[PDB]
């Protein structure tokens, strides 16, 4: 819309719906800083607000109440701070009810934002989380333009049973559609190899980085953070996927150099 | 030695999905000063209630209690040098925050606890949870090393008419103690710094704008200066000028929410 007046509200290119930790580097707590480094602005709508990841001996907090979550999304439209919105990334969701609301918000939002790149990360592994899969299939999946599932995630989501490249690539294809343009499947195979397969309607690219064995969390969230930034900045999908992975590696090293059990972002 | 993240400051206040108030503005400000901080939200609103709409609420007592205990169980307070408190949500939250602080004193005796008695304005009266004022005076004040209340917030804390500069100074003086080393009264723009042995009246430009969060910016900047080695009055004057600065940039930017310009 060219005929729209100037909005005195803040603007952001991305709305990241993920978890938030007071202490830690996961979800938006690590995503937002990363996006900010790429020179982009972002609004972070938490799914859950925890003291830290449930991976430590103790953690506190819970899932954001629907009325709240619902309001947070709505408010953004009312404050009129979505003119520059070019993408919406979804990470760890706390409940299926949240996914439905987000899907409702996204459906209505697309009507005005056609270039809206709804990237979705199918976090369904704690075997599977209850009710979360169907919610994804019915609400988010149909809207997602890109999905970054891992072997497992892709397996339960597609019901298919990937056992080899072709299989994993085939399942990916089955998810493509008029809306879903790509599927970035990843797998962590000491020294942990990170195998990534980029699948689209007219091509299948592959990338493979060697990774440091660690208990560091948020690497996936960080990856998605740099994936989306690389894309909103013009990089080719497979180019953005490659870099993103290199960036995550640069971060994990830097993090281990300072011997930190939680990710630390070094200048980008 | 610890491998856990560390922070010089722990900011306990409001958080908004959209807007520049509470830790939303304070954290980024603290970062600009090259300091680490852990933000513990007391309320998680969509935006400030000064808008047509707003959603969200107070963080549950168990959550709030946990966020604090977590910082300890995680052992990320090895470098803790100050704790700032801003917009609180409930008196139960302040009471919990107080106990937590009384605990930290045992292993952080030099701790600089700075509280912003967000209770009301002279042109609004008490605009927060009615129970907060009592909770402040009862639990938080006793721990505070320094506080930053406005004329009205000072009347509610001391129960004295602070409309007169001298009467206000007097009210502030009576508050000082072995714990409370200073009181930055607020009300161009006049900012009075009161210490057991002195009184400084700082005054800078004033802008007619309904920009919210400036208070939180002030404290975030004030605390940074104190921790960065600046003397009290100098820190108070710098924090105030920074805020004046920020608002000019925001207005210049034709925006209704604060925007941090490079420091
Ligand atoms: N419109 C303004 N013009 C100039 N300085 C301002 C303005 N608004 C805020 N400030 C600066 O911010 C400081 C404190 O913030 P603010 O005035 O919002 O809080 P307050 O209601 O006086 O009290 P508190 O410290 O509880 O927020 C002021 O005293 C001043 O130094
Ligand atoms: Mg105030």
Measure the CA–CA gap between A196 and A239, rounded to whole angstroms.
Answer: 12
Query: Which of B15, B84, B80 lies closest to A29 in space, CA to CA?
Result: B15
Cβ separation of B47 and A71 shorter than 8 Å?
Answer: no
Containing H/E element for A257? helix A237-257
DSSP 8-state secondary structure symbol assigned to residue A186: E
B30 touches chain A (CB under 8 A): no
Query: Which of A166, A129, A123 lies closest to A147 in space, CA to CA?
Result: A123
Query: Which of B180, B36, B12, B184 lies closest to B98 in space, CA to CA?
Result: B12
Q: Which residues of A175-202 are buried (b: 16+ CB within 10 A; e: fewer)?
A: bbeeebebbbbbbeeeeeebbbbbbbee
Measured from the Cβ of residue A21, the count of other Cβ atoms closer than 10 Å reads 27
Measure the CA–CA gap between B58 and B51, rounded to whole angstroms.
Answer: 18
Q: How far is CA B200 from CA B144, B151, B174, B183, B235, in A?
A: 20, 16, 17, 11, 12
What DSSP letter does each residue of B63-114 carry, written as one string?
HHHHHHHHHHHTT--TT--EEEE-S-S-HHHHHHHHHHHHHHTTT-TT-EEE
Give the side-chain half-sphere CA count within 13 A for B203: 3
Give the side-chain half-sphere CA count within 13 A for B198: 6
Q: Is B240 in the pocket of ligand 1 (CB under 6 A)?
A: yes
Q: How far is CA A257 from CA A222, A253, A254, A264, B178, in A?
A: 18, 6, 5, 10, 43
Cβ separation of A75 and B47 shorter than 8 Å?
Answer: yes
Residue B66 has phi, psi (to 5 degrees) of -65, -45
Query: CB–CB of B38/B84 below 8 Å?
Result: no
Q: Whose CA is nearest to atom 11 of ligand 1?
A: B240
Alpha-carbon torsion, ordered A83, A44, B256, B14, to 10 deg? 160
Measure the CA–CA gap between B202 and B151, rounded to whole angstroms.
Answer: 15
Query: CB–CB of B71/B38 below 8 Å?
Result: yes
Give the distance (Å) from ligand 2 centre to CA of residue A118. Answer: 39
Q: How far is CA B150 from CA B145, B174, B189, in A?
A: 17, 16, 12
Measure the CA–CA gap between A23 and B71, rounded to whole angstroms.
Answer: 7
Q: Which residues of A221-234 are buried (b: 16+ CB within 10 A; e: fewer)?
A: bbbbbbbbbbbbee
DSSP 8-state secondary structure symbol assigned to residue B228: T
Of A43, A57, A75, the CB nearest to B55: A75
Dmax (CA) of chain A: 58
Name the experimental technique: X-ray
Query: Which of A41, A91, A100 lies closest to A69 in space, CA to CA?
Result: A100
Helix (H, G, I), strand (E, B) or coil at A253: helix
Measure the CA–CA gap between A139 and A131, rounded to whole angstroms.
Answer: 12
Measure the CA–CA gap between A4 and B71, rounded to whole angstroms.
Answer: 46
Which residue in this structure is represented by tokens 């004033």? B206
Determine the CATH number of domain A1-268.
Answer: 3.40.1190.20
Chain breaks in chain A (C to N over 2.5 A) after: 126, 189
Q: How is domain B1-263 classified at the CATH fold level? A: 3.40.1190
Cβ separation of B4 and A78 shorter than 8 Å?
Answer: no
Measure the CA–CA gap between B153 and B221, rounded to whole angstroms.
Answer: 20
What is the atom index within ligand 1 of the atom nearest the CA of B240? 31
**Sheet strand arrangement including A182-188:** A61-63, A42-50, A14-21, A87-90, A117-120, A146-147, A182-188, A192-200, A204-211
Q: Whose CA is nearest to atom 27 of ligand 1?
A: B215
Measure the CA–CA gap between B185 and B240, rounded to whole angstroms.
Answer: 12
Measure the CA–CA gap between A225 and A89, rounded to whole angstroms.
Answer: 8
Which of A24, A52, A216, A267 should one mutate to test binding to chain B, selecting the residue with the greatest count of B CBs within 10 A?
Answer: A52
Measure the CA–CA gap between A149 and A171, rounded to whole angstroms.
Answer: 11
Measure the CA–CA gap between B82 and B227, rounded to whole angstroms.
Answer: 8
Q: How far, in whole angstroms, is CA A153 from its chain's centroid?
A: 13
Residue A8 has phi, psi (to 5 degrees) of -80, 10
Helix (H, G, I), strand (E, B) or coil at B223: helix
B20 touches chain A (CB under 8 A): yes
Q: Quick one: which ligand is closest to B115's CA?
A: 1
**How close are the terminal C-alpha atoms of chain B, in Å?**
32
Q: Which residues surround ligand 2, an ion (CB under 5 A)?
A: B 118, 215
**Experimental resolution (Å):** 2.6
Adjacent-strand bridge partners of A78: none
Give the distance (Å) from ligand 2 centre to CA of residue B214. Answer: 9
Closest chain A residue by Cα to residue B55? A71
Q: Where are the domains of chain A?
A: 1-268
Measure the CA–CA gap between B258 and B68, rounded to whole angstroms.
Answer: 28
Query: CB–CB of B47/B17 below 8 Å?
Result: yes
């Amino acid at each position: 819309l060219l005929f729209n007046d100037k909005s005195r509200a803040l603007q952001a290119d991305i709305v990241a719906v993920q978890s938030q930790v007071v202490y830690g580097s996961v979800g938006n707590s690590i995503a937002v800083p990363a996006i900010k480094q790429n020179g982009l602005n972002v609004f972070a709508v938490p799914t859950v607000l925890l003291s830290n990841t449930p991976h430590y001996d103790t953690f506190y907090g819970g899932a954001i109440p629907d009325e709240w979550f619902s309001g947070y999304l709505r408010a953004l439209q009312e404050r009129d701070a979505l003119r520059q919105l070019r993408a919406v990334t979804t990470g760890y969701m706390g409940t299926a009810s949240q996914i439905k609301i987000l899907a409702e918000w996204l459906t209505a939002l697309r009507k005005d934002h056609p270039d809206l790149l709804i990237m979705v990360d199918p976090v369904i592994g704690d075997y599977v989380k209850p009710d979360l899969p169907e919610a994804y299939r019915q609400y988010l999946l149909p809207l997602a333009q890109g999905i970054t599932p891992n072997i497992f995630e892709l397996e339960i989501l597609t019901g298919k049973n990937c056992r080899d490249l072709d299989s994993a690539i085939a399942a990916a294809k089955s998810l493509l559609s008029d809306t879903l343009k790509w599927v970035v499947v990843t797998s962590a195979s000491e020294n942990q190899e990170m195998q990534v397969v980029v699948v689209t309607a007219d091509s299948v690219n592959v990338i493979s980085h060697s990774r440091v064995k660690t208990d560091l969390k948020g690497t996936g969230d960080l990856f998605c953070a740099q994936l989306i930034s690389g894309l909103l900045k013009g990089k080719a999908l497979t180019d953005a996927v490659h870099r993103a992975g290199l960036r995550v590696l640069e971060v994990m090293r830097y993090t281990q150099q300072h011997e930190s059990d939680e990710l630390i972002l070094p200048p980008l």
